[PDB]
Write an enzyme that holds these catalytic residues in place. Sequence first.
Site, PDB file in Angstrom:
ATOM      1  CD  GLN B  28      -2.711   1.200   2.562  1.00 20.96           C
ATOM      2  OE1 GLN B  28      -2.440   0.625   3.619  1.00 20.96           O
ATOM      3  NE2 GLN B  28      -3.892   1.770   2.339  1.00 20.96           N
ATOM      4  CE1 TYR B  55       0.973 -10.288   7.543  1.00 23.45           C
ATOM      5  CE2 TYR B  55       2.533  -8.847   8.684  1.00 23.45           C
ATOM      6  CZ  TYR B  55       1.405  -9.662   8.701  1.00 23.45           C
ATOM      7  OH  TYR B  55       0.686  -9.845   9.859  1.00 23.45           O
ATOM      8  CD  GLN B 179       2.015 -10.816  16.405  1.00 20.98           C
ATOM      9  OE1 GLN B 179       1.276 -10.664  15.434  1.00 20.98           O
ATOM     10  NE2 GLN B 179       3.322 -10.661  16.341  1.00 20.98           N
ATOM     11  NE  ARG B 229      -5.743  -2.192   6.081  1.00 21.25           N
ATOM     12  CZ  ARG B 229      -5.244  -2.620   7.239  1.00 21.25           C
ATOM     13  NH1 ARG B 229      -5.835  -3.601   7.915  1.00 21.25           N
ATOM     14  NH2 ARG B 229      -4.153  -2.046   7.729  1.00 21.25           N
ATOM     15  CB  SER B 290      -1.499   3.994   5.184  1.00 26.76           C
ATOM     16  OG  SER B 290      -2.559   4.856   5.545  1.00 26.76           O
TER      17      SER B 290
HETATM   18  N1  LIG Z   1      -0.395 -12.297  13.847  1.00 25.41           N
HETATM   19  C1  LIG Z   1      -1.544 -12.048  13.140  1.00 25.41           C
HETATM   20  O1  LIG Z   1      -2.388 -12.882  12.854  1.00 25.41           O
HETATM   21  C2  LIG Z   1      -1.794 -10.566  12.657  1.00 25.41           C
HETATM   22  C3  LIG Z   1      -0.917  -9.565  13.145  1.00 25.41           C
HETATM   23  N2  LIG Z   1      -1.162  -8.227  12.684  1.00 25.41           N
HETATM   24  C4  LIG Z   1      -0.156  -7.179  13.193  1.00 25.41           C
HETATM   25  O2  LIG Z   1      -0.741  -5.884  13.589  1.00 25.41           O
HETATM   26  C5  LIG Z   1      -0.597  -4.939  12.489  1.00 25.41           C
HETATM   27  C6  LIG Z   1      -1.938  -4.744  11.837  1.00 25.41           C
HETATM   28  O3  LIG Z   1      -2.759  -3.643  12.317  1.00 25.41           O
HETATM   29  P1  LIG Z   1      -3.896  -3.442  11.118  1.00 25.41           P
HETATM   30  O4  LIG Z   1      -4.307  -4.791  11.495  1.00 25.41           O
HETATM   31  O5  LIG Z   1      -3.177  -3.181   9.823  1.00 25.41           O
HETATM   32  O6  LIG Z   1      -4.606  -2.182  11.718  1.00 25.41           O
HETATM   33  P2  LIG Z   1      -5.226  -1.288  12.745  1.00 25.41           P
HETATM   34  O7  LIG Z   1      -6.421  -1.906  13.365  1.00 25.41           O
HETATM   35  O8  LIG Z   1      -4.248  -0.718  13.707  1.00 25.41           O
HETATM   36  O9  LIG Z   1      -5.726  -0.179  11.704  1.00 25.41           O
HETATM   37  C7  LIG Z   1      -4.655   0.540  10.993  1.00 25.41           C
HETATM   38  C8  LIG Z   1      -5.350   1.048   9.701  1.00 25.41           C
HETATM   39  O10 LIG Z   1      -6.350   1.975  10.149  1.00 25.41           O
HETATM   40  C9  LIG Z   1      -6.187   3.205   9.479  1.00 25.41           C
HETATM   41  N3  LIG Z   1      -5.681   4.147  10.462  1.00 25.41           N
HETATM   42  C10 LIG Z   1      -4.644   3.999  11.366  1.00 25.41           C
HETATM   43  N4  LIG Z   1      -4.482   5.021  12.155  1.00 25.41           N
HETATM   44  C11 LIG Z   1      -5.461   5.874  11.758  1.00 25.41           C
HETATM   45  C12 LIG Z   1      -5.805   7.169  12.235  1.00 25.41           C
HETATM   46  N5  LIG Z   1      -5.102   7.700  13.236  1.00 25.41           N
HETATM   47  N6  LIG Z   1      -6.862   7.813  11.619  1.00 25.41           N
HETATM   48  C13 LIG Z   1      -7.529   7.174  10.571  1.00 25.41           C
HETATM   49  N7  LIG Z   1      -7.275   5.972  10.069  1.00 25.41           N
HETATM   50  C14 LIG Z   1      -6.220   5.372  10.725  1.00 25.41           C
HETATM   51  C15 LIG Z   1      -5.359   2.975   8.266  1.00 25.41           C
HETATM   52  O11 LIG Z   1      -6.219   2.679   7.186  1.00 25.41           O
HETATM   53  P3  LIG Z   1      -5.736   2.956   5.583  1.00 25.41           P
HETATM   54  O12 LIG Z   1      -4.639   2.072   5.313  1.00 25.41           O
HETATM   55  O13 LIG Z   1      -7.062   2.593   5.010  1.00 25.41           O
HETATM   56  O14 LIG Z   1      -5.395   4.400   5.580  1.00 25.41           O
HETATM   57  C16 LIG Z   1      -4.379   1.825   8.757  1.00 25.41           C
HETATM   58  O15 LIG Z   1      -3.817   0.955   7.809  1.00 25.41           O
HETATM   59  C17 LIG Z   1       0.344  -5.534  11.443  1.00 25.41           C
HETATM   60  O16 LIG Z   1       1.352  -4.615  11.147  1.00 25.41           O
HETATM   61  C18 LIG Z   1       0.839  -6.854  12.073  1.00 25.41           C
HETATM   62  O17 LIG Z   1       2.195  -6.743  12.526  1.00 25.41           O
HETATM   63  C19 LIG Z   1      -2.222  -7.931  11.785  1.00 25.41           C
HETATM   64  C20 LIG Z   1      -3.024  -8.945  11.368  1.00 25.41           C
HETATM   65  C21 LIG Z   1      -2.901 -10.332  11.745  1.00 25.41           C
END
Ligand SMILES: NC(=O)C1=CN([C@@H]2O[C@H](COP(=O)(O)OP(=O)(O)OC[C@H]3O[C@@H](n4cnc5c(N)ncnc54)[C@H](OP(=O)(O)O)[C@@H]3O)[C@@H](O)[C@H]2O)C=CC1
Lengths: 325, 325, 325, 325
Positions: B28, B55, B179, B229, B290
């Site tokens: 992304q 990833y 995790q 997203r 992001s």
């Molecule tokens: N072990 C496992 O099974 C898993 C582990 N993970 C871990 O945790 C992390 C994933 O968190 P994720 O699950 O991506 O997300 P979050 O629930 O933390 O959401 C983050 C997303 O929300 C949006 N966002 C973040 N901050 C803001 C803000 N301040 N205002 C508005 N929108 C915001 C963005 O969307 P946009 O991109 O649309 O702008 C961003 O990509 C990964 O990096 C990974 O290391 C994640 C999944 C599975």
Amino acid sequence: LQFYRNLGKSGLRVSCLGLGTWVTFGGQITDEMAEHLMTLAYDNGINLFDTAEVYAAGKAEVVLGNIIKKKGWRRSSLVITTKIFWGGKAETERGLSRKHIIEGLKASLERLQLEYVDVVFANRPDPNTPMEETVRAMTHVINQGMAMYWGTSRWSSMEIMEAYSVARQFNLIPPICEQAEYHMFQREKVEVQLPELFHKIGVGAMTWSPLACGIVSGKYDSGIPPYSRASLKGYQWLKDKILSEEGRRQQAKLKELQAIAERLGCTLPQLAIAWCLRNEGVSSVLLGASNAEQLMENIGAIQVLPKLSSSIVHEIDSILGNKPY
Amino acid sequence: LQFYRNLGKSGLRVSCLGLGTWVTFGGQITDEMAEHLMTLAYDNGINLFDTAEVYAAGKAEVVLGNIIKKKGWRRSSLVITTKIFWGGKAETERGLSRKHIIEGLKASLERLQLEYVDVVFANRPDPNTPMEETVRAMTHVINQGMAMYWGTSRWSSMEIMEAYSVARQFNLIPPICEQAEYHMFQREKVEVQLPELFHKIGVGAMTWSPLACGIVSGKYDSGIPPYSRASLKGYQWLKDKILSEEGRRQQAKLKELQAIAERLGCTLPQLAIAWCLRNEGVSSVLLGASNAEQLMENIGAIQVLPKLSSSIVHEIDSILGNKPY
Amino acid sequence: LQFYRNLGKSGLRVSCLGLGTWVTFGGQITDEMAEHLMTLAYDNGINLFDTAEVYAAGKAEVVLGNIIKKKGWRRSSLVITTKIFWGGKAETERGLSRKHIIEGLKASLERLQLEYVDVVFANRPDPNTPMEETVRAMTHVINQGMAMYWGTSRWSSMEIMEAYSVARQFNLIPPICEQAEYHMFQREKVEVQLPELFHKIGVGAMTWSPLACGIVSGKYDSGIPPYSRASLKGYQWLKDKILSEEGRRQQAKLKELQAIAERLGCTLPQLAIAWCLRNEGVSSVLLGASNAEQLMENIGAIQVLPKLSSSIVHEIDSILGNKPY
Amino acid sequence: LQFYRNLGKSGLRVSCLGLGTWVTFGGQITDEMAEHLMTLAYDNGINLFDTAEVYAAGKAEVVLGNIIKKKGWRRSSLVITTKIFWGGKAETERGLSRKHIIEGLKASLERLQLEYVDVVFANRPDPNTPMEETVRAMTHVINQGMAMYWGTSRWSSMEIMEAYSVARQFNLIPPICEQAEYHMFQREKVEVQLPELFHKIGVGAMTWSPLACGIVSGKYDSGIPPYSRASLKGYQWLKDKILSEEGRRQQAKLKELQAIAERLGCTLPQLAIAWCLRNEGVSSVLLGASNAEQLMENIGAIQVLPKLSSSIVHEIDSILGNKPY
Ligand SMILES: NC(=O)C1=CN([C@@H]2O[C@H](COP(=O)(O)OP(=O)(O)OC[C@H]3O[C@@H](n4cnc5c(N)ncnc54)[C@H](OP(=O)(O)O)[C@@H]3O)[C@@H](O)[C@H]2O)C=CC1
Ligand SMILES: NC(=O)C1=CN([C@@H]2O[C@H](COP(=O)(O)OP(=O)(O)OC[C@H]3O[C@@H](n4cnc5c(N)ncnc54)[C@H](OP(=O)(O)O)[C@@H]3O)[C@@H](O)[C@H]2O)C=CC1
Ligand SMILES: NC(=O)C1=CN([C@@H]2O[C@H](COP(=O)(O)OP(=O)(O)OC[C@H]3O[C@@H](n4cnc5c(N)ncnc54)[C@H](OP(=O)(O)O)[C@@H]3O)[C@@H](O)[C@H]2O)C=CC1
Ligand SMILES: NC(=O)C1=CN([C@@H]2O[C@H](COP(=O)(O)OP(=O)(O)OC[C@H]3O[C@@H](n4cnc5c(N)ncnc54)[C@H](OP(=O)(O)O)[C@@H]3O)[C@@H](O)[C@H]2O)C=CC1
């Protein structure tokens, strides 16, 4: 007297006297001085040299390492030891976690330019790390050939026993030694507790600060020829201790001890050091020296050893009036 | 509040907030953005960075690795973690068999340009692999210095306990962490089950998706400044969830929560994240970002922490009406 | 039918059919043929390739290794296995002593140009070596990353159990598989004994010589298009067996079986091979092929599998009249 | 007779005769002679070659190593063994401490130009080192691939048993062999004690000084064609023993034995050596030779073996009158 003895009940033979590198190497003295001090020590039979990743932010280790490569002494004739705990300002750069023990010792080894140290010590206890993790980590670096043995420092008898417990329960390697402070004004631990661990689990004692950082040489009233640490950068605490109400009390007793020294025909520093070696329980005493004169004077304590009778010892106890019980 | 805490009962100290790399690095956002996001995180005290071999088909790991070499941060100041399970289209390129754990982690390490990761996780349970094989494999890579510790992810309490059982029976290394997903709409596991494992076997909790992939920021009705997203390639499922009958129900409650946020003087995202850290049971929360604005806004949740009273929490429970029991 | 299955109860997934390299690679066929046969096998889903340090005095391994580097297939998509026992004319160049297992596998790896094999087998039992030494050695090479698992071949149930006993008593790694001969005229061990070990200690069965070295294809009376091994250098024994009084008896039954084949609409070789896979107890069958035609015909046995009813099986038993009991 | 036999109950097959390197390689004889002696031995089936870090201050090892690289014999066809204990004048350069075992064997390996030896022996007991430390160290070098097995020398039955005890209690590797002196005038240990250890814990016997340093060849009255060691630098003790009151007593019995030899149609040296191999309990006898003539004469003892009847043995006992009980 036995010049070389076993460190605890291990097979590692060390000289009753060793040369440390705290405050000195890579700091207070010059690299030229350092090379001179180690050569003297080495040529006089000393094979034990202690350092730490924290000393002069790694510089002590670098200097030590440089002297070793420059002189070309065989690795098998040296007993190098370093302590691990404080290795950086980052959160994960301190402690006894597997992460820091591996990374820390690996770093010290790079600075020392050595494949391994003979003994790696935990510079102090870690409240935030389970004993099992620490003992596995220590066992790990030993199996990886990064160290031959490991020891503890500033740990309580119980903590050391806990390490031993962990080792025997999971079949890991127990600690072989504890680096404790020991001088006429700090006696309880080495005289009462350490022997207990030696008999129960073979843990040996390697003592440090034979002169209480210099306080016992009397150099702050009736001292030997040398320089001053109490007046060094960052040792305000040492100066304070010396100028403390009690600093004066002990400085007073030294005067009485100074007498016994002359009577024995040796310097106060020599008396104090040979005093630390009277113990069969002390495997080795780590010396501190900023110049060749202090070093050779200290190394002379060996001679003062035979002339240390029980009555002379008892006389010392009366002056100090702090014999452990 | 304690910014740094132990991951479970291990000796590994992590920042209460970490930066993940899912959907972002090598996908992304641009590599320039990534380098900017990690630098911000690092300079702000975050030392925990999570990734996975799956990833962006390894690209996330490559980017992460490039930023690390480019910036030159000391390895000992970072806590890198990666997950293993899906590493290729070949039959033997997925799972938790000794073969894939070795080959998978070795590959991630090559892409990351690192000798080892601090924690290697099983990205999920493997029905086709005996627990013993997996635990030996994990124990193996740790003894080979390819990893410092290992953890589980999406495993049931019983499965984690089974891992522990295997480790103690054959004297292998137990997992130190799980995790798990954790946000205002996913609470049961972290609030009820994980604490149980922490007390019984010292397993810590590292949570992810604090904002439910962005749903909790309200960006799909009352959201913060950023990108989308739910409208990204392959996330039709996320869009569906948001547009679902229930997607609307939760999106409704957010409106009520948004109120509490303003009342507290912070953004909804900050409320939601600080909410995840109220737990003493949560060692660290993995953030998703992001852009730099989202990251700093999130990192701000730390401030929202003290102003989170019990009544404020209870008020949240009533709005969510899903408190675990 | 499941094309891929677990080798015993381990996590290693193998194709129900594998390609061996005995008599073929570095011997009977050309390197060009070999590269063609493996590519066909690989492109058709086969990921299991067996060899041995004794085959063509190491040449088989070299060819196999060359094909692998030339084709560039990912190591993680292949399951390579080799056997150890006969590795030279010197006294210490044969057996299952720690010395030969280390030196032997190391040599095979050099010839194969691989860091490790997925499974290293003991080509046969060693009367002169204590089981403990052997199991430690096998455990050792696995911990050294020279192999992922180890297996046995031509060992008795009791011997395999003894290996398991040793592993559990000293906490070493048990064997995961036994390479046994299996075809319509060799059934007892695989049908009666191996299942026992599978349930008791998870040992899987990898069978070889599905066609009894070619005898079952009927090529010595009613055979398929190919070349002749019974008339090859050093296989006087094979020719003898075929010309033996019993060689004729079995060659007679094949005629009756040939009927069932036509009736099923497949070749005799296909019937015989699919017959070996009817067993849920057989993890994989190692094929032998000197040309692309034989290989594809054999790989066709997969189709003959569903059309193999219980009555068809019983009908086979009556013709063979050797069903195990 | 079995030319090759197992060393104790291990899987290591050795020739009943081996060639040692004490006093010879890098000392008494020239490198040209050495290369000639080993080639003869090797070409005659001998695969066992013993040395020590103390022999000629490491020179013996260097010569041995040079011959091996020069001749190009496959490492897998040789059984190299070296002893550790005396490796330098420094305090920590001798003994069986983990430190010296690691450093000592590592040094021998460098001089030998080999990655590992087949068997590393403790040249003698160490009073200053705990058995556990020693057994772990031995186990360590074996796991590090620096050696395949380890043995003891000049250890008492109890000491060997203590090693075994330690190994089984901590799950380390037991010793497989004891290098003991054995000739017509030194019998008790090998004839009475060693068999006991073989049956109880599988320890094999490798004997040395078949001719009592040359005394049994009669070369000091009725000897075979060769040179003199008793008159070599630093062997005043050997000369003394020979000239001792008892030196004459044994030299007298040799005269009577010399008779039996002629009667058997072989030299006295051959009788004496074949005498050492009558024992099924002796895995191998280490020969000592300063020239090709002595070597081939000795290697001839193999022929004298069958012609050694029980009555001939009993006749020997009567002449020696020292049979063990
Ligand atoms: N072990 C496992 O099974 C898993 C582990 N993970 C871990 O945790 C992390 C994933 O968190 P994720 O699950 O991506 O997300 P979050 O629930 O933390 O959401 C983050 C997303 O929300 C949006 N966002 C973040 N901050 C803001 C803000 N301040 N205002 C508005 N929108 C915001 C963005 O969307 P946009 O991109 O649309 O702008 C961003 O990509 C990964 O990096 C990974 O290391 C994640 C999944 C599975
Ligand atoms: N593991 C642990 O926790 C610790 C271990 N240690 C070990 O022990 C060593 C430390 O000993 P230290 O503690 O420095 O000191 P000592 O108690 O041995 O005192 C040495 C100091 O006293 C002075 N001095 C030494 N000899 C003489 C003499 N003959 N006449 C006059 N003054 C003399 C010098 O002062 P000046 O420099 O002022 O001239 C010198 O630096 C270190 O090298 C380290 O290896 C030390 C601390 C903690
Ligand atoms: N672990 C152990 O002890 C052993 C393991 N094995 C394993 O199994 C494999 C051996 O199988 P092998 O034992 O060689 O043979 P098979 O029983 O599978 O017979 C294969 C042979 O039969 C002929 N053949 C094959 N397919 C056809 C066909 N479709 N039509 C006509 N003839 C055909 C060929 O003969 P020709 O060459 O005459 O054309 C070919 O070499 C090896 O690669 C090895 O990995 C083998 C032996 C021992
Ligand atoms: N582990 C331990 O403690 C020890 C192990 N050993 C091992 O065994 C070997 C030692 O055997 P060693 O002890 O040297 O000797 P031997 O008892 O085998 O005697 C060999 C010596 O006898 C003479 N000799 C040999 N063959 C003949 C012959 N055919 N005719 C006449 N004289 C002959 C030579 O004397 P000259 O040189 O005078 O010509 C030669 O050096 C070493 O190589 C070593 O590996 C040895 C000692 C201790």
